[PDB]
Amino acid sequence: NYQQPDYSSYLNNKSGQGSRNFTYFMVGSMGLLSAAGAKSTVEAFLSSFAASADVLAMAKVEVKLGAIPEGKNVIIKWQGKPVFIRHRTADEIEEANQVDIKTLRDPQNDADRVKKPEWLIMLGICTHLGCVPIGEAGDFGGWFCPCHGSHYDISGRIRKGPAPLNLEIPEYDFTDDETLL
Amino acid sequence: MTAAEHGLHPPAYNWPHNGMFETFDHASIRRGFQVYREVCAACHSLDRIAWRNLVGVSHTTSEAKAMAEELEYDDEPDDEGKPRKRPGKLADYIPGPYENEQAARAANQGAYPPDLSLIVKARHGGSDYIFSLLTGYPDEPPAGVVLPEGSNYNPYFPGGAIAMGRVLFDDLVEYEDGTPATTSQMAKDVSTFLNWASEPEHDDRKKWGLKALVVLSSLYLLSIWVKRFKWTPIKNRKFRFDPP
Amino acid sequence: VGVSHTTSEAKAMAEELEYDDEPDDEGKPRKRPGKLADYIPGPYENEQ
Amino acid sequence: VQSMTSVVKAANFILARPTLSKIITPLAQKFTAYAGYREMGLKFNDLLLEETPIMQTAIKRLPSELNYSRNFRILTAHQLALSHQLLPAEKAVKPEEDDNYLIPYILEAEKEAFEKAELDNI
Amino acid sequence: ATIFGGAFAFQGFFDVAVNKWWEEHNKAKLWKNVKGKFL
Amino acid sequence: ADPLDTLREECTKTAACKPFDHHFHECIERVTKEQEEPDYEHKHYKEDCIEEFFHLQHCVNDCVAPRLFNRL
Amino acid sequence: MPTRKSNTYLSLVNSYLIDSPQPSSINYWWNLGSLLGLCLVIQIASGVFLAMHYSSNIELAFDSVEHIMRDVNAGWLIRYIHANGASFFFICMYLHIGKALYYGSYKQPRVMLWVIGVVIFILTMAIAFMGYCLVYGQMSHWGATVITNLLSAIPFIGNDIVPFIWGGFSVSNPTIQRFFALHFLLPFILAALVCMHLMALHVHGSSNPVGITGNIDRLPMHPYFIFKDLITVFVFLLIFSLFVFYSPNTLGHPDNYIPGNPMVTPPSIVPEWYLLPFYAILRSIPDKLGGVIAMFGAILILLSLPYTDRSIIRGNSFKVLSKLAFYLFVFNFILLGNLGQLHVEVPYIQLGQFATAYYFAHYIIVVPVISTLENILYYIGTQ
Amino acid sequence: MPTRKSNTYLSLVNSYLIDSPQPSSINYWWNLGSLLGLCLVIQIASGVFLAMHYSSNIELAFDSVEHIMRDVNAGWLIRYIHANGASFFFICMYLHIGKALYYGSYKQPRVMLWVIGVVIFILTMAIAFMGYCLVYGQMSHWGATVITNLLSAIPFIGNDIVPFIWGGFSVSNPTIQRFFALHFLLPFILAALVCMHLMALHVHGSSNPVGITGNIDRLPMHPYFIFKDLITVFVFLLIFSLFVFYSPNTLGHPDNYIPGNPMVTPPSIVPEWYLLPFYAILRSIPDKLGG
Amino acid sequence: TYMGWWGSLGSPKQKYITQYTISPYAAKPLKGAAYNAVFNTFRRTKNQFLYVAIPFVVVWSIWTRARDYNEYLYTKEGREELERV
Ligand code: HEC
Ligand code: HEM
Ligand code: HEM
Ligand code: HEM
Ligand code: HEM
Ligand code: FES
């Protein structure tokens, strides 16, 4: 139709696939570098949601242990959740001696739920809709979940109610008249 | 203001941690912490630094916990309700020498030695200033200047009169690593330690900054190339206007 | 004041009690007679 | 915005007086040379603020050839500003070609608008 | 998608490169290298 | 001896710092003379050498700053 | 039609981002708009992550900020982002006003846009200032006190408005709490004003560095001016990282790290740098009421600008004298900003008075006189 | 053209309020939307005036609320509004969903609209719940605790997401502070969602009680359905006053006025009334993840 | 309005103008970026320098005189002149 301007100089020296491949590589590299930067920024921000150093330091705090009446259930505030530190007498140990492989959502024994009967540690938070169980209303003789009436055994096992598991035992270690979390 | 009120401008010492890619000389942080406990703690609070902050920075967790033990801290009253005291633990904040501002002012002729946990970010010269403040005391004040009783002359202090008076003297502290304890060296250690206490994120901050510069610079170069490439069609347009 | 007691009565009831003030400049604890702005005090220092 | 009629009134007020003419006109040519619009292919009347009803009417009443020439000059100016380059001196719009082609239509539009305003307040 | 997967690759590459260059540029200053002199 | 004192001594001896040091000592002498006159405590403007001291200290700091920490 | 046009929300996104017919000759200055939006996101995003840890009580504000700095995992990063990002927000906004002043972006077709611009500016200043008051450092508290005391200069309502502003008898807990609430809020009102800004832009489109109509040659936005916006955004973030990670406190004032103490005033009271110019104007006028009126005029006169600019040609790019006038005005503005942080002293009081005089004279004399003179010079030159 | 159409801002206001061609046969139920919008304002308005006095610290949240009630001039009014107005916000939202379920307002031409509706619903619930947690009463605290414990049931991420929510190891100061921040915020996200709702409504218009097309007979909105909106608004405000001024705590739970104490769980845990149905569903399924 | 959508942007009837271009993949990217960014940038700076220099020179001269006078006032020899002001 008419003469076009000469692009001779403007032309690339690459082949059809080479130039397209390089352009797509550069665009993809930009996209993935942006993805990496956005991931770094978003992870750094979301790490703010995580427990600050203050909260981490406050947790794993030892409890002032010592002599207490046998069978009495003490209370603590380790990591917010109440801790039902109770020095169940030899009667509780004897009762727990009766094993139970059936009629128990999670059959267990004081062998693993406690280190020594002279000091029994168990978080008071319940299983279903975690609540603080009553220290004497348990149908099984231990703690009772007031919200659903669930009964917690003297060994912490879930006897009856909506309990999804057994009464959690914190990771607290024992020592000479001290609690070592 | 006259030069004196603004305070002599501290110079720029080539700190080990000045450049964009250098950390605190954690040896210097520990040495400055020793200088602090040995000299400053008599007057200055430095409350915002918890013993846990020193684990992995200048003291092993065992050393920090041990240091925390010697001190006593308020505890929730006993079962009867009487006051109780407990040995310090890592989570506890370093305690100042004075219970409140009133006690500090009473014990320092009314001057209130400010908390040092932010003194580096709360002064114009930053670390330099602190160093210049500690080693700026001249043996003989410049002639003609009369200081209020109890005040000491230091040109780097705004107004020229500072109540602190020289504290760092040669061989005042026996450093753990056998480092000589010249007053200049001690000022350097305390300045570095206070700068850390004021900027504990400094090391991680600058490492993250290096990562960010690398990523954003590569991405910016990629963006330049992509834009120039994709605009070549427009920047290479050629027109013709051929009416009758 | 204006609900069940005239301001004078409330003020007088305030002086009848003791409250903790900012400790004296010597650092010793100090106490002051109550004033209107003060909250009514409970009979126990804490839940314990 | 200053109505073009007022601009021409001021321009003839200055031009009529030989002293003001001899002073300004050299500065006028120098200012239009330093303005830098001519090196981009634009005549003066291309720069005029188009987004006004009077100006829009004036453009709408241009002859076809002037309209197409204006379109091409504006397009060339846009391309030059886009590529960050200027026309060579031989291709730039010479002072003689900066011919004030659009002013007559703008003045006619201004006259119509002013007559309408005057009669509306008769 | 594969964008999220490649984010791991790029972030990890830059992260390891920087952590390895930084602890080499500052090895004389880091606590993990200085704690021995104070032990 | 601490490196800072010896660096200060070296720098004040430098030719660049010499004029400021000379001015500072002359000012010290003049201020002492002013203090000698018995009506000194009546004078409204009691001269002081803070400015000369500041100039000397700035000129000395510009020298010590870069070199100080190489000694520590 | 394509999904990007049939769907309503994608249709809006297309109208504003993918197919918006930008002129082809726009410089990088036109990218500043995008940056501002990005900054508006950052200020919000990081901002929301500071309210998750900031405690607005007066006895906890500064300590809460320090808790963010030292205790929260990335708290130092979020705080530095939120502060230096406000500073960069104002840098980009000043550049976006300077561009709109240099090119006649404020002229006939876009006056409404310009007006919204000014409002945004006004609003932003408040936000920024209010945010500063939240740190409750020395400079924070005393800046709040000075602003309230000056606002107490209203003829009759002044004595009654200030206690409402304080919520008490001096800058105290109610003041800081209400500043926190209004500071969290007003950014979203500003987002609404930004959407209004974008609609007022879309109705008539954006201007050109040449000023002439762009309709003859326009380009889509998705292939073009999106990857230009990416260049500008990455340059912005690169400099923002140079600041945030290295020397983050350069723009801030050291005294702000001293917890606020009403009983001891700091040696000098200065806003954050971006408010210094207006502050200077405020101190140039002796009367407090006159000072406040002149301060607010220093912003609101931008509204008068589109009518005082009597130029038939949009923009400065092709105007000699107008470019000298604009650069003189910009440098006087920087001089006012500099005087903002300097003490009231012998030469500086007179220099600030002259600087304010010329700052207003620009708008009310120089722009009209220069524009008219240049119109006449243009017409005489072509004939 | 008229100023109400030439100006873009007034053009939008006209398209949505003054000339929106509403069908002529819409009942009073179609007014609920306006009320919801009104309530969104009220929730925000009173809300912005509570944060000016609310202190989000866990040791100050409840005392700060009581300071609002007792010390702030109209603080009792602002709190009772912000609370009973949330209850009424959900009353009107349930009525707006019931209307959309009875009349087929969710059917073909408006499916998109319906979707935003649902999202709004979801988002709103969060906001409301989160705001309730700010009071930090017994029921407030234990509702937060139960919610987070249930969300702890996600298969693998559950054990890790909860600390990110709690900001710690249990509902504590970080949890209340983040709830306050996100609660101040999410209402504006909800305002944006409401704008999207209105856009999806304007694209295809509103339905009819008869269901058939309204295009045959449509009425403007300024003289019609704005004055119907006023009847509905004034009835809403009259009932809202009967609640706010008389028996304002009827909808709330008394236990929420006991400051939160983790060491004593109250006799029963119930959400605020409008979330009770879903809560019931949650308890109907035994498995926590199932629930 | 003064800018429609793509179909009708408000441009006058445009005719007789032919626009040529080549594919980006067929064109050399960053051809003379090295030479252009130096020579053309210097040309642009040369053209626009005076407009930024004359105002800058004036303002910075005023600032320098003011700053120098202020420095002079707060000195032992500037005491009397400071007092007179
Ligand atoms: C005893 C008294 C001490 C000791 C042992 C230390 N500090 Fe000081 N210091 C002290 C007071 C009462 C004051 C207030 C002076 C005033 O005029 O307000 C100060 C001052 C400081 C400052 C502030 C300087 C300034 O704001 O310009 C700093 C910084 C400072 N002191 C540092 C510091 C260091 C590093 C110490 C190490 C042992 C130290 N002080 C000890 C009182 C006393
Ligand atoms: C958050 C703050 C702001 C945002 C997000 C914003 C948004 C935008 C956008 C997207 C553009 C188009 C791109 C461009 O022209 O650069 C633009 C241009 C513009 N900006 Fe803003 N703006 C903001 C603040 C302001 C302010 C405070 C002013 C003036 C006081 C202003 C004045 C303008 C004007 C007049 C234009 C039109 C430019 C032209 O057409 O030449 N803007 N803005
Ligand atoms: C354009 C919008 C905004 C601007 C320009 C802005 C600017 C600022 C500035 C300059 C500060 C001073 C902080 C400092 O110097 O340390 C500040 C503080 C603050 N801002 Fe913003 N802000 C904006 C929006 C927001 C939003 C949406 C939030 C939401 C939470 C927010 C939350 C805060 C908080 C909590 C502080 C306290 C500062 C601190 O604790 O360090 N801001 N803001
Ligand atoms: C649709 C949006 C919103 C809904 C449905 C809503 C609902 C609620 C509800 C039910 C409460 C419980 C208060 C109580 O039981 O005492 C609450 C608390 C609260 N809300 Fe809102 N809210 C909304 C938006 C907002 C906004 C925008 C703010 C802005 C500040 C806000 C601020 C607050 C505050 C500060 C509280 C604490 C309650 C108190 O201190 O008494 N809310 N909200
Ligand atoms: C703040 C909350 C809301 C506001 C302000 C709002 C706004 C509106 C408005 C103004 C109308 C027109 C009047 C009417 O038809 O009643 C409307 C109708 C509608 N509402 Fe909403 N809406 C909200 C929440 C919801 C929610 C949560 C849903 C469903 C889950 C929903 C579903 C609908 C539907 C489907 C329509 C169309 C009704 C029809 O055309 O027959 N809306 N909405
Ligand atoms: S209380 Fe809900 S199941 Fe244990």
Q: Which residues of E1-39 are buried (b: 16+ CB within 10 A; e: fewer)?
A: eeeeebbeebbeebeeebeeebeeebeebbbeebbeebe
Given a contact cutoff of 8 angstroms between Cβ atoms, the answer to whether C33 and C15 are in contact is yes
DSSP state of A63: B
Which are the contacts of I39, defined by CB distance < 8 A and separation ≥ 6? none
Write down the residue that tokens 């004279």 correspond to: G361
**Cβ neighbours of residue G69 under 8 Å, at least 6 residues apart?**
B201, G75, G76, G79
Own/partner long-range contacts of G268-272 (Cβ < 8 Å, ≥24 apart): G268/G341, G268/G343, G269/G139, G269/G142, G269/G143, G269/G146, G270/G139, G270/G340, G270/G341, G271/G129, G271/G132, G271/G143, G271/G340, G272/G86, G272/G87, G272/G128, G272/G132
Q: Which residues of A are catalytic?
A: 148
Tell me, what amino acid is at G198? L
Q: Residue H177 sits in which domain range?
A: 1-291
Is A115:A106 a contact under the CB 8 Å cutoff?
no
Torsion from C-alpha of F33, F37, F43, F47, nearest 10 degrees: 10
CB of B232 within 8 A of CB of I27?
yes
Q: Which residues contact B23 (CB under 8 A, 6 or more apart)?
A: B16, B17, B202, B203, B206, E26, E29, E30
Residue with tokens 């082949």: A15
Structurally, chain G folds into a number of domains equal to 1
Question: Does the C-beta of B111 come closer than 6 Å to ligand 1?
Answer: yes
Length of chain I: 85
Surface-to-core class of residue H203, CB atoms within 10 Å of its CB (0-12 exposed, 13-18 middle, 19+ buried): middle
Q: Phi then psi for H179, rounded to 5 degrees?
A: -60, -40
Chain A contacts of E9, Cβ < 8 Å? 32
Q: Measured in angstroms, how far is the CA atom of residue A104 from the centroid of ligand 6? A: 16
* Token duo for residue B195: 């700068």
3-state secondary structure of A174: strand
**Structural contact between residues B192 and B127, judged by C-beta atoms closer than 8 angstroms:** yes
Which of these is catalytic: G207, G272, G284, G319?
Answer: G272
Provide the residue count of chain H. 291
DSSP state of G363: I
User: Distance from the CA of G33 to the center of ligand 2, in angstroms?
Assistant: 5
Task: Tell me if G298 sits within 8 A of G359, measured CB to CB.
Answer: yes
Which of G86, G89, G93 has the alpha carbon at shortest distance from G133?
G86
D114 min Cα distance to partner chain I (Å): 23
- Closest by CA to A51, choosing from H159, H134, H162, is H162
Mutate to test the interface with H, among A47, A52, A55 (most CBs of H within 10 A): A55
Q: What is the distance between the alpha carbons of residues D91 and D40, in angstroms, rounded to a whole number?
A: 9
Indicate the domain borders of chain B: 4-200, 201-244
Helices (H), chain A: 16-49, 53-58, 90-97, 110-113
A54/G71 CB distance under 8 A: yes
Nearest ligand to the CA of G63 is 3
Question: Rounded distance, CA G107 to CA G122, Å?
Answer: 20
Reference G353, options G336, G341, G334; nearest CA is: G336
Which residues of D touch chain I, with CB atoms under 8 Å apart?
Answer: 36, 50-51, 56, 59-60, 62, 64, 67-68, 70-72, 75, 84-85
Amino acid making up residue A64: K
Task: Give yes or no: G71 in active site.
Answer: no
B188 lines ligand 1 (CB under 6 A): no
* Residue H274 near ligand 4, beta carbon < 6 Å: no
B85 part of contact set with chain I, CB < 8 Å:
no
Number of domains in chain F: 1
- Count of alpha carbons within 13 angstroms of residue H245, beta-carbon side: 6
B39 with B173: CB under 8 angstroms?
Answer: yes
B185/F2 CB distance under 8 A: yes
Is A145 known to sit in a ligand binding site? yes
Tell me: is residue B59 an annotated ligand-binding position: no
Give the tokens for residue B59.
């003291």
Mutate to test the interface with I, among B6, B232, B242 (most CBs of I within 10 A): B232
When CB atoms are compared, the residue of G77, G255, G343 closest to B1 is: G343
Closest CA to B233 of G17, A12, G216, I12: A12
The amino acid at residue B198 is S
Residue B210 neighbours by CB under 8 Å, 6+ apart:
B20, B21, E18, E22, G245
Distance (Å, rounded) from C-alpha E11 to C-alpha A40? 7
Q: Name the experiment that determined this structure.
A: cryo-EM
Q: How far is the CA of B199 from the centre of ligand 1 (A)?
A: 19
Nearest to H124 by CA among H150, H97, H163, H158: H97
Q: What are phi and psi of A13, to 5 degrees?
A: -95, 0
The residues that bridge with B75 in the sheet, in sequence order, are: B84
The Cα of F47 is separated from the nearest Cα of chain B by a number of Å equal to 6
**Angle H226-244/H75-102 helices, nearest 10 degrees?**
130
Residue of A25, A29, A39, A41 best to disrupt the E interface, most CBs of E under 10 A: A39
* Residue A123, phi then psi, degrees to nearest 5: -65, 135
- I5 to G338: CB separation less than 8 angstroms, yes or no: no
> Can you tell me the distance from the alpha carbon of B237 to that of B227, in angstroms, rounded to the nearest whole number?
16
Q: Which residues of I touch A16 (CB under 8 A)?
A: 25
Segments making up each domain of chain I, as ranges = 1-85
Between vectors from CA F33 to CA F31 and to CA F36, what angle results, nearest 5°? 115
Structure tokens at H1: 């053209």
Q: What span, in angstroms and rounded, lies between the C-alpha atoms of A142 and A84?
A: 11
